[PDB]
Structure 1
């Protein structure tokens, strides 16, 4: 059963083993984690813009194979639109991909594991954890 949606920075922390606590908690929870395809997009971008696209792509693919990738669907989109409207009324800036990922997790009742929790606590009805 899926319990966590990992943000991009948490994925990178796991991959770099820094902070090590993140990777250790990732390993603890193998089988219960997913990422949004929005996060997959960010990871692919980091690899393809790097000096070693093929190598870094392989790193991402190996990481991703240990988790599920969830399609950003109509429900995800609908929550996201609602959240953006709510954040705007509140005067609370969240980055555009972060907003999508928040909507995606909320639409699935998942905990967002991210390290910029102050910015995600600005979203209503969302549970977050920092494993770092």
Structure 2
């Protein structure tokens, strides 16, 4: 069964720099990792805005084909709505897409893997790991 949801920041970081430290974690936890459809939208955007969309898109599609992509459903949206209010009423900012990724994981009990721990630590009830 799945265990980790990779954040958008760690995906870009991995796609760009392909670091061996993250390669170890990927080989070790292969099959237990997923991304939010929100993250898929961001990297497809990163590809389409490049000077070589089809090329960069093709390395995106190879990365995605190795992980499950989870649809952002009513459960994810519900938890995200909670998180937006839980953060608002404590004044701690988190970016809009990161809120949606946060709620998707919490809705399923998944561990967020991110290199931006300072923001995701602002979300209540969510487990964070840094694989970078």
Alignment partners' CA distance in 2, 1:120 and 1:40: 19
- Aligned CA distance change for structure 1 residues 9 and 23 (closer, same or farther; 3 Å): farther
Per-residue CA deviations over 1:11-34 (Å, capped at 9, x if unaligned) read: 223223444312221121110000
| Secondary structure in structure 2 of the residue aligned to 1:90 | coil
1:45-66 C-alpha deviation (Å, 9 max, x unpaired): 0000000000011000000000
**Please, what is the CA RMSD of the aligned residues?**
1.0
Is the Cα–Cα contact under 8 Å of residues 10 and 22 in structure 1 kept in the other structure? no
TM-fit CA distance, 1:71: 0.2
Contact 1:114 1:128 in 2 (8 A): yes
Give unpaired runs (5+ residues) of structure 2: none
The list of structure 1 runs, each at least 4 consecutive aligned residues, that deviate by more than 3 angstroms after superposition, is 16-19
TM-score (norm 1): 0.95
Stretches of structure 1 that go unaligned for 5 or more consecutive residues are none
Count of residues in Structure 1 that have an aligned counterpart in Structure 2: 131
| Aligned-partner SS, 1:72 | coil
